[PDB]
Amino acid sequence: QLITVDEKLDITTITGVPEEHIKTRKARIFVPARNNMQ
């Protein structure tokens, strides 16, 4: 019996992470540059 949930997925309250390490952190999403030595 499925239910309809239109809200955005937000799991911050159930991950156990302290607040300072959610709001004040800046994640970088990238593909690492090739190591120029190789």
Partner 1 sequence: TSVKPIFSRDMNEAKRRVRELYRAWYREVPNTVHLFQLDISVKQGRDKVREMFKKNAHITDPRVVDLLVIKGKMELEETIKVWKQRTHVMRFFHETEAPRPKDFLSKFYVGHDP
Partner 2 sequence: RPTVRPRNDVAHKQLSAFGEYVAEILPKYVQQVQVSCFNELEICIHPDGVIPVLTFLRDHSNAQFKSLADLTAVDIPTRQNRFEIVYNLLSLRFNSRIRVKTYTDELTPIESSVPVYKAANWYEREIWDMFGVFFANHPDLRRILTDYGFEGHPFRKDFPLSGYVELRYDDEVKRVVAEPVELAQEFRKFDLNSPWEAFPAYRQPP
Q: Which of 3, 8, 14, 29 binds partner 2 (CB under 8 A)?
A: 14
Among partner 1, partner 2, none, residue 38 binds (CB under 5-8 Å by kind): partner 2
Nearest Cα residue to 11 out of 22, 2, 20: 22
- Based on CB atoms, which residue is closest to partner 1, 8 or 34? 8
Q: Are 12 and 22 contacting, i.e. CB atoms less than 8 angstroms apart?
A: yes
Query: What does the block give as tokens for 34?
Result: 């090739």
Residue with tokens 């120029």: 36
16 lies in the binding site for partner 2 (CB under 8 A): yes
Binding residues for partner 1, rule: CB under 8 A, are 1-7, 9-11, 13-14, 24
